[PDB]
Amino acid sequence: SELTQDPAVSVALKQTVTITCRGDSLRSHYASWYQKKPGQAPVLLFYGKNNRPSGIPDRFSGSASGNRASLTITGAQAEDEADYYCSSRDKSGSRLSVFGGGTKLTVLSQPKAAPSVTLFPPSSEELQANKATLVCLISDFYPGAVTVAWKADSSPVKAGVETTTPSKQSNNKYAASSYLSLTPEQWKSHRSYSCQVTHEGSTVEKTVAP
Amino acid sequence: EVRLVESGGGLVKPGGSLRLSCSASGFDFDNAWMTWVRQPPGKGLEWVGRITGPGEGWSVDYAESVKGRFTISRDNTKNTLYLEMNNVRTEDTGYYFCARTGKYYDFWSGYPPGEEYFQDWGQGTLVIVSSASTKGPSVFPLAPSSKSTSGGTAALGCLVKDYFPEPVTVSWNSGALTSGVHTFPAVLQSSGLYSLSSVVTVPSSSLGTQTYICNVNHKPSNTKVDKKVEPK
Amino acid sequence: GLWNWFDITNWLWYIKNLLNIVHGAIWGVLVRKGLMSLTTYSGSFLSGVIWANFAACVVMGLAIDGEVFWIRLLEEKDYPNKGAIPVYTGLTTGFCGTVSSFSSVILEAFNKAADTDIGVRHHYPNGAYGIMQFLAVILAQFGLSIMGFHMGKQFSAVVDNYLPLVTKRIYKVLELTSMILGVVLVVITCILIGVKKQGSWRSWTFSMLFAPFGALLRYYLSKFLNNKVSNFPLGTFTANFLGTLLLAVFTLLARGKLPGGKGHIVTNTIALHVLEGLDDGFCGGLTTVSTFVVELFGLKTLFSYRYGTISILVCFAGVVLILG
């Protein structure tokens, strides 16, 4: 990870906000910035010291100082919600370029709502087939920054956990899901299995036991 | 009015080969760099490589995870960009974009060879490097956990598992019931088999009479399978 | 065809370094001579060029905070660095460097020594007094320089934690000073008698002309011949050695007057003044305590004392060799 970024940032309407790009090579190289809406081609936003292509609204201003590259958005409108990427030299003076790990921006169009967490014990129907998939249910949440953590009793597990990127809901909320592929033998070897989920610093946990 | 269109997608068996083309016009092409950028779905996009012009004799560059496995070459006469892949690993999947490259170097503040900025991008092409194949789906009844709640809104669905490729378009009661029916997006397991679960928002007062029959219908395999959800 | 980007950008960076270092040296020599003419002895038992180095370090203290790549290089770490060694070329090796007078410091120490061994080096009184004054002057110079660097770093932190006040606000003033220097160097130097009419006007002209060449020589020594042997940059050291021997030779040529009639030859106000301008600019732009201080207790833990001792002792031994 040559370049690092904040995974997600939230801001209300008409209020300014900044997106921070941190990297070692930014000391001797300027940055670039790319708005990325899903299913659309990224459009160049801001690059160099003070260069911005014609057509883009003035609200996107970027500054470079020290080992940071900052693009600050002034007055995020309805259509400004997207992912923003920073790109520059990977090694300080090499013939390459890289990109940051991702920065999801969310304009607040819905007051914050807690997710509806649901967990189902593995059905016996998959159990006789030597399969045990745990299905954790994440729906009706806003905004889209949820991290699924699976705990084996007090201990954790990562052996078989799979998580999907949250998507749209009919009422503009978000929903997602996670799966844990586990053998039936290890299913009965632990006291409890939980899929903790955290959203904007708030967490909800649901436990299922044999 | 500058536009770049990619072409040459489709599924590729790992270790195979695939050639990607990019149509471009409406701008000086013999003196402008092209850069291949890829994006795995749901993740951050990554750099593949760039190809130069007459400034250096059409030189090449590549990513540290790509160097030696890809090939970038340009045919100026046909005004098209070509990308060649061999020995494709499972990580190569995602959207491939070919974007024109700009050059920027301030004369007082900077360090050679300056930054690169892409003055435009292309619509994109999709490549899916999967070791799987056309296989029928499965139906596992997601029991609504008879204990659960008794007066609230419970949940019950189906484990549509091990189906490929997209989509499955699960149905419910042959369309009779739509009480909060969501078909969640499929998840990518290690074995490259798509799987998704859809749930109907059921009150905890179902008491059996509220019957929910679960319709699974996979077009690519032409498999039509039905399953019933019943609590433990 | 048109050009080659990977080469045109390298050439632009090189010419940027050249222009920045030349302008920095030219603008720093005038500050040096302002300090020197402002000696106003009063107290300051040493005085003269003593303050100049003390100034050069303090301002350099505001650069070493953001220098990084030099600091990282003198830390043997961080493989993916490969950065520019003298970042802030127009200020680190420029104004901060050219102002320093390492060769002048050693010459002052030797001159105040005044042939410590008057007739015999074995005698305790004369030798002890001479070594005492030499150690005192060297300790004063380097301790004041290091203290100035320390206050520079501390004040840099104290001003940085509050507010940067936009860095480019200093970039604009640097640029406007550059245009002022260019305009002056054009008009005043071009509008003059062909024999470079005497007075305070010519007293700085040849020194100004010779200073940037010495600064360039030190810069190329500190970029090419540097980092050739580990923990011993050897670039600044060879630059200082060349500067101090050159200054000693030309001071013997001017002050010593070994034939006796060389002063009579330089009675004409050309031969002595070209040497004076050389002393002002060339050896003064080739020897830098500011880069020397950075190589000192800034970083290079522990081993720094070895570098300082070897540099000082070899320089003093050389300038003694010119005596013979």
mmCIF file of N, CA and C in Angstrom, chain B residues 4-10 18-23 36 81-83 96 98 123-127:
data_model
loop_
_atom_site.group_PDB
_atom_site.id
_atom_site.type_symbol
_atom_site.label_atom_id
_atom_site.label_comp_id
_atom_site.label_asym_id
_atom_site.label_seq_id
_atom_site.Cartn_x
_atom_site.Cartn_y
_atom_site.Cartn_z
ATOM 1 N N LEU B 4 -12.926 7.046 -26.111
ATOM 2 C CA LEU B 4 -12.176 5.800 -26.187
ATOM 3 C C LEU B 4 -13.103 4.653 -25.818
ATOM 4 N N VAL B 5 -13.172 3.643 -26.680
ATOM 5 C CA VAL B 5 -14.035 2.489 -26.466
ATOM 6 C C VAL B 5 -13.163 1.244 -26.434
ATOM 7 N N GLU B 6 -13.289 0.466 -25.367
ATOM 8 C CA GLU B 6 -12.584 -0.796 -25.225
ATOM 9 C C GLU B 6 -13.414 -1.933 -25.809
ATOM 10 N N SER B 7 -12.735 -3.028 -26.139
ATOM 11 C CA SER B 7 -13.415 -4.194 -26.683
ATOM 12 C C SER B 7 -12.522 -5.412 -26.518
ATOM 13 N N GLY B 8 -13.156 -6.579 -26.427
ATOM 14 C CA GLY B 8 -12.427 -7.826 -26.305
ATOM 15 C C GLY B 8 -12.547 -8.477 -24.943
ATOM 16 N N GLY B 9 -13.701 -8.332 -24.305
ATOM 17 C CA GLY B 9 -13.925 -8.906 -22.996
ATOM 18 C C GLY B 9 -14.226 -10.389 -23.065
ATOM 19 N N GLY B 10 -14.941 -10.862 -22.055
ATOM 20 C CA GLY B 10 -15.359 -12.247 -21.973
ATOM 21 C C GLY B 10 -14.563 -13.023 -20.938
ATOM 22 N N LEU B 18 -5.849 -13.426 -23.917
ATOM 23 C CA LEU B 18 -6.907 -12.533 -24.366
ATOM 24 C C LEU B 18 -6.273 -11.248 -24.873
ATOM 25 N N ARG B 19 -6.855 -10.693 -25.932
ATOM 26 C CA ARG B 19 -6.353 -9.478 -26.557
ATOM 27 C C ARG B 19 -7.420 -8.397 -26.479
ATOM 28 N N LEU B 20 -7.051 -7.241 -25.934
ATOM 29 C CA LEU B 20 -7.970 -6.131 -25.717
ATOM 30 C C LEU B 20 -7.643 -4.999 -26.676
ATOM 31 N N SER B 21 -8.665 -4.476 -27.343
ATOM 32 C CA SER B 21 -8.509 -3.389 -28.295
ATOM 33 C C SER B 21 -9.182 -2.127 -27.776
ATOM 34 N N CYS B 22 -8.690 -0.982 -28.249
ATOM 35 C CA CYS B 22 -9.225 0.320 -27.857
ATOM 36 C C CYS B 22 -9.305 1.212 -29.086
ATOM 37 N N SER B 23 -10.526 1.530 -29.505
ATOM 38 C CA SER B 23 -10.734 2.476 -30.589
ATOM 39 C C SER B 23 -10.660 3.898 -30.049
ATOM 40 N N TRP B 36 -3.084 1.908 -19.505
ATOM 41 C CA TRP B 36 -4.052 0.876 -19.158
ATOM 42 C C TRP B 36 -4.280 0.892 -17.654
ATOM 43 N N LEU B 81 -5.382 0.920 -29.754
ATOM 44 C CA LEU B 81 -4.497 0.458 -28.693
ATOM 45 C C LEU B 81 -4.766 -1.013 -28.406
ATOM 46 N N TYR B 82 -3.701 -1.805 -28.325
ATOM 47 C CA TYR B 82 -3.803 -3.245 -28.136
ATOM 48 C C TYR B 82 -3.171 -3.653 -26.813
ATOM 49 N N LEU B 83 -3.835 -4.569 -26.111
ATOM 50 C CA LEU B 83 -3.339 -5.138 -24.865
ATOM 51 C C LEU B 83 -3.384 -6.653 -24.961
ATOM 52 N N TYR B 96 -11.275 -3.169 -17.350
ATOM 53 C CA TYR B 96 -10.108 -2.565 -17.984
ATOM 54 C C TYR B 96 -10.502 -1.265 -18.670
ATOM 55 N N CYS B 98 -8.783 2.070 -20.853
ATOM 56 C CA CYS B 98 -7.647 2.662 -21.547
ATOM 57 C C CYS B 98 -7.875 4.164 -21.625
ATOM 58 N N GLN B 123 -15.133 4.108 -21.690
ATOM 59 C CA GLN B 123 -16.299 3.484 -21.072
ATOM 60 C C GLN B 123 -15.911 2.244 -20.277
ATOM 61 N N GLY B 124 -15.038 1.410 -20.832
ATOM 62 C CA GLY B 124 -14.549 0.262 -20.098
ATOM 63 C C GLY B 124 -14.968 -1.074 -20.671
ATOM 64 N N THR B 125 -14.205 -2.117 -20.351
ATOM 65 C CA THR B 125 -14.510 -3.476 -20.764
ATOM 66 C C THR B 125 -14.390 -4.402 -19.562
ATOM 67 N N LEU B 126 -15.128 -5.507 -19.605
ATOM 68 C CA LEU B 126 -15.204 -6.447 -18.495
ATOM 69 C C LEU B 126 -14.517 -7.754 -18.858
ATOM 70 N N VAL B 127 -13.643 -8.226 -17.972
ATOM 71 C CA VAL B 127 -13.009 -9.533 -18.095
ATOM 72 C C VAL B 127 -13.190 -10.274 -16.779
#
